[PDB]
Design a protein around this nucleic acid. Structure first.
Lengths: 160, 194
RNA sequence: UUUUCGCUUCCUUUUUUUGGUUGCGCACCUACAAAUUGCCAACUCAGAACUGCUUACGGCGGGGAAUCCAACUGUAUAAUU
RNA sequence: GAUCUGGUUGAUUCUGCCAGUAGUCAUAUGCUUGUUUCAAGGACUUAGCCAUGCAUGCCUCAGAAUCACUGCAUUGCAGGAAUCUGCGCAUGGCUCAUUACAUCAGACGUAAUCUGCCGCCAAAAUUUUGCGGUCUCCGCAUUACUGGAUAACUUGGCGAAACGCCAAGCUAAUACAUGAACCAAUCGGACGCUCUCUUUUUCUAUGUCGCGGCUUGUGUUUACGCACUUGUCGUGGCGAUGAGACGUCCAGCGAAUGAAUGAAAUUAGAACCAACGCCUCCACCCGGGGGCAGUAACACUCAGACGUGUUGACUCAAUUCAUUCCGUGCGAAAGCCGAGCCUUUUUGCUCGGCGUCUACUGACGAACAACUGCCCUAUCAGCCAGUGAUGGCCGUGUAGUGGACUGCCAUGGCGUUGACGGGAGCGGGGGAUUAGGGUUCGAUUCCGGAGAGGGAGCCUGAGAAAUAGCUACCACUUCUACG
RNA sequence: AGAAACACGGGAGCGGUUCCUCCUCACUUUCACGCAUGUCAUGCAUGCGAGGGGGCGUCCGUGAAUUUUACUGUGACCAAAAAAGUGCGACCAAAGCAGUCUGCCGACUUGAAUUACAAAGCAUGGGAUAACGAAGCAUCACACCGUUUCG
RNA sequence: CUUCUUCACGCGAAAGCUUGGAGGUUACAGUCUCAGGGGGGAGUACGUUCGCAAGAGUGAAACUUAAAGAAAUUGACGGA
């Protein structure tokens, strides 16, 4: 936004030239506007935020333009210093056959995030591969997971 | 030649990145072409494996496509007005995807004028004409609202548009008229650097 | 809104105290966009082009590597040092 | 064979290391060899240097006389000198120089592409030409049809040489050229100045009614005439009963740009008004009033269609319009064998199996990419950001993705599970040896990779940086009558 | 880990039931240019016919759709290079795929079988592991069945 | 804190070994951690880092060698 269009320039989109005919009353003063959000690839459904939302973002595939297919990795968000792109950490235990033990290992991964999301390092996330999106990125964040749709909302009902 | 590699850049531990073998020809690209407004010299180049890609030097007319009116007319690219990037770029009239031009408008005028029957300043094909010309208008009057402003652009035949192809790649640029909010904005922007 | 914001009317307690009530004011952007815009304004640095060809005004610290010697700055034989 | 034994004491029991010991069928070498069977064999050091010698081509029946030559008495298929024709030539062989998350692997992505060869196929714009004439345009035509150079050869010739070389002169190709069709698909768009109800039967089909005029000021060669539509009126209608038709005019078949097209989510009551749709008095029809499609209908063959591509996954395909294009408009002006019938046979006319031959798919393959996994080493730790470092912006730019790269912007990114640097070899399959647990190797014959004079660079091709290709540089080398 | 909701396409289903004059062996308004069964070879004949309705308890496909869901180990399977190393007496050893044939101017007939830190996927399972429960207060100071409602 | 009587097998090469020793372990396995890994060369080297300054911290190879060690035992011996 920024009272539409935040950035220096709009974008075009693969779907934005206008069906200037339909004048739908603002239902409950909504209406609400068509968008490009979609069935999301090899399964699931986007946030309401895509469809209802009004950001933009090219590097997004979700509301936008890239395509995810192949491994879908899950990760802990590990860096968001950088804008609208995140980096998640994957710790994992690396087993030594001879010693019959495991040692802690990890690897960091930049994955682009669609703007409709909003995670913080730590956050558990599910990202998917894509044609390179950036030098470092061939992944795009796909859903920021959480527990019981709300992560502990009833046992937190605080004091005064 | 020039390799399209990520690999020669820092391995992002800062980590040095090194050489194994080749500068691979398959990843060899070409340095920036990009036409400059005027009369073509465009080269089909025998591109990867074969195949042509069109290598534009200079270009002059377009097919300005009326996004909101769905017919497109072939016309002058009368001029570039903005290159998002750069004042030099506009100045050099080196045309790129999304380059913002200025169109002739007469066809499009005519077109409206043909289609609906109506114009702004001229009358060339009006007089050619009950009526089945009674229709052209009946249609229009069923419902159009054009932009005013667009009309005005048409009067002076100098009308803004955005390119829908990658000239520097394709050698060709046609485009569709710049529009709306974006246009307002770009009008704003247009005015906001004096 | 069980407190020392204030007062009026009214109710309640004895009360023309309080408290409640009412009207208004007192604290509280909760009035809040952006500050759009208007105006005028500055030569600094920077950038880029265009351009071509010049140890050229001016003014402009040689450097290095060691040995001896004195820490240093200071001081001085007017008028050889 | 899951043992050791030999070696420190004055003895003694001890911790304990060396010596031996078993392999390695691993290298060298010494010695010493009956057969004979079964055998690897200049990696290693210097990817040192190299004479030498030798190590990509080939045609069928199925593109091309050339009078060379050859063939045969002669023909003469043939052959063919000797080429123009094609593919391939960029698997090899050789090596490990190179190399270290790079690469090898598992294991993957390629909706981020490009793909000769192949299977598996599919096609519609035309004019040719000829003729005739004539405008060189039209007309006509059973239309049968076409265009241009250049190898090899000849000569002359050049030169020390070379891969040294000209020069003219001579003729064919599925090479080059036009590409040539006058024949036919269902199929769009745009205009009208155009015309205004198509075919039949008793009982029967549809896709039927065309259906405006006057006329203000104003407008025709300065005295006729339309119209505008203000006004007025016609089938309602204060200015067009069109639909239908008849014509015209633009390709509707690749590509490109644009635009639009992309499921099977409540009960709306039902009502109004606008729509079609349907039925209703007659009359062959035209016409001609009615009423309905929602509290109600039964007949002239007489009230509510033939349309949801393709993956979990597309801004995918696939279609239309618009606008557009220096690859397709393969659609046949070329070449076998085979045969027909005419014709003698041939010409012609037939039929049959192959050639040159484009787009889309598939293989095929190649490019491109992650997750996972790899070896030494901290008196190696921080590394990392002139810009590319991390990311964010538009475009570039590429086969496409991507800082690949520009241009702008943010300020990042990585590391003590050790980053960075530095160490060591390509890396796997595997190899090797240990009861077991384990050690160690992996030059090389497995793969994958790598590489290729040193060094870079390029052209081409489907395809290589392509190494018995070029190009220039370094280092080295040959030849010269030393140009 | 399915399941509960909705929804949409195939539902005397794909399977299943239940009431009914379902009891009636022609389903169409047409197109249904079919089928089965025969002959005559398509001439002739027969037929396509409980249809249908009520009910379903209920099936299948699927959907855009409403709500709510850890790991690892083990299990099992799933997914693959040349191998010496795992296969038929090759004379036989080092090997092989052969070979069984006069009995074969011919038959029989081949050729077993095979494994890794790491692979994800799947089945379980709970033993152990992280995620969270942290932290208590919104719960008086999970929110609930859930009716009737004509308000 | 014991001492340590005294007891424990146990553990140990012994010497010896308690609170809950050097015990309860090749019948090898509670956690965490440091260290160690023939001997000599050297704990040193201009190796390197603290440190005013000693010097600490950290810390080699070359070179060399067949032992070095330990406890007990007995013996010998003693300016015991």
């Amino acid at each position: 936004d920024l009272t539409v269009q935040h950035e220096k320039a709009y974008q075009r989109q693969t779907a934005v030239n206008e069906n200037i005919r339909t004048a739908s009353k603002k239902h409950v003063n909504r209406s609400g506007h068509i968008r490009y959000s979609k069935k999301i690839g090899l399964g699931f459904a986007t946030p309401k935020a895509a469809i209802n939302g009004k950001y933009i973002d090219r590097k997004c595939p979700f509301t936008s333009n890239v395509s995810i297919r192949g491994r879908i990795l899950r990760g802990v968000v590990h860096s968001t210093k950088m804008r609208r792109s995140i980096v998640i950490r994957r710790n994992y235990l690396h087993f030594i056959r001879k010693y019959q033990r495991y040692q802690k290992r990890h690897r960091n991964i930049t994955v682009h995030c669609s703007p409709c999301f909003d995670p913080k390092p730590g956050d558990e996330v599910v990202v998917g591969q894509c044609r390179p999106l950036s030098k470092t990125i061939r992944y795009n964040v796909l859903q920021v997971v959480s527990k019981s749709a709300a992560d502990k909302m009833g046992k937190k009902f605080s004091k005064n | 030649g020039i390799v399209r590699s990520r690999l020669h850049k820092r391995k992002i531990t800062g980590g040095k990145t090194k050489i194994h073998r080749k500068r691979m020809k398959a990843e060899l690209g070409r340095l920036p072409a990009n036409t400059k407004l005027g009369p073509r010299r465009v080269s089909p180049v025998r591109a990867r494996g074969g195949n042509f890609k069109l290598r534009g030097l200079r270009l002059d007319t377009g097919n300005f496509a009326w996004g909101t009116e769905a017919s497109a007319q072939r016309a002058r690219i009368l001029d570039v007005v903005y290159n998002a990037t750069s004042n030099e770029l506009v100045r050099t009239k080196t045309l790129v995807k999304n380059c913002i031009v200025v169109v002739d408008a007469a066809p499009f005028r005519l077109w409206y004028a043909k289609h609906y029957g109506i114009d702004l300043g001229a009358s060339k094909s009006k007089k050619a004409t009950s009526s089945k010309l009674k229709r052209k208008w009946e249609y229009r009057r069923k419902h159009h609202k054009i932009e005013k402003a667009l009309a005005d652009q048409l009067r002076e035949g100098r009308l803004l548009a955005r390119i829908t192809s990658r000239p520097g790649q394709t050698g060709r640029a046609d485009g569709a008229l710049l529009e709306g909010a974006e246009l307002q904005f770009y009008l704003k922007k247009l005015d906001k650097k004096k």
